[PDB]
A paper describes a structure:
TGFβs were discovered in the early 1980s4, and three close orthologs are found in mammals (TGFβ1, TGFβ2, and TGFβ35). Human TGFβs are produced as latent glycosylated precursors (pro-TGFβs), which consist of an ~250-residue N-terminal pro-domain dubbed latency-associated protein (LAP) and a C-terminal ~110-residue mature growth-factor moiety (GF). Human TGFβ2 GF is an elongated α/β-fold molecule consisting of an N-terminal helix α1 disemboguing into a fourfold antiparallel sheet of simple up-and-down connectivity.
The crystals belonged to a hitherto undescribed, tightly-packed tetragonal space group, diffracted to 2.0 Å resolution, and contained half a GF disulfide-linked dimer per asymmetric unit. We detected gelatinolytic activity, which points to a contaminant present in the purified hα2M sample. Taken together, these values indicated that P41212 was the correct space group, and the final model after model rebuilding and refinement contained residues A303-S414 and 23 solvent molecules. TGFβ2 is internally crosslinked by four disulfides forming a cysteine knot and a further intermolecular disulfide by symmetric C379 residues links two crystallographic symmetry mates to yield the functional dimer. Here, helix α3 of one protomer nestles into the concave face of the β-sheet of the other protomer. However, a major rearrangement is found within segment Y352-C380, which encompasses helix α3 plus the flanking linkers to strands β4 and β5. Owing to an outward movement of segment W354-D357, α3 is translated by maximally ~5.5 Å (at I370). This, in turn, causes downstream segment E373-C379 to be folded inward, with a maximal displacement of ~6.7 Å (at A374). The second protomer is rotated by ~10°, so that K396 at the tip of hairpin β6β7 is displaced by ~9 Å.
Numbering used by the authors:
A (entry chain A), B (entry chain A): 303 to 414
Amino acid sequence: ALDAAYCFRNVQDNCCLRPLYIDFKRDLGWKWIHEPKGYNANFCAGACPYLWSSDTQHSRVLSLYNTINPEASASPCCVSQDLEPLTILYYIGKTPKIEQLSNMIVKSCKCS
Amino acid sequence: ALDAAYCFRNVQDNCCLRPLYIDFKRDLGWKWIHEPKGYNANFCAGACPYLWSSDTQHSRVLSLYNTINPEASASPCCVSQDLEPLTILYYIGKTPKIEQLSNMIVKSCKCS
């Protein structure tokens, strides 16, 4: 998979997970989250070679088209695959509460 | 929507549907399809401004992050949204048959 272990080994031009830490107050302007101060959101970026696409007929027809006619490219797009939640601390008045924020973290990537 | 009527008006740098005709024999090497000789598959391509992403928390957090910190971009990806089937003619020996090939055509685009 295009995850931390495979992708964080070196810098790669191809579709891969990229490290990113987001500080809620500083980078999002979210003051409602008291803890943690930030988290490793990560993101997906990089070139998609033509055979890296699947799960849709249009994508596999497009991949086959591209492999035969490269010069006239319609290159696939590096997108998120596995997403994970994050537990945070917020307040209801003076009472500290905890809740899960869904799909905050990207763990792996794929080509569209 | 980022469909033919909106997108085929002019050339646009931003995420939009792009016209593409694929000839089965000539461009795919598919000799099994006798009719039609090709079809308008189309494809999605172009720049995604930061607020064009939705449906995932990670995508909206990433869009918000990007709007605040543009220079340090993790730009969204222009992908297919609505897909349509195509009916074709093939043979089982000397008998002509027809069948639907699913999700062959892209009708609209979206930003990841």
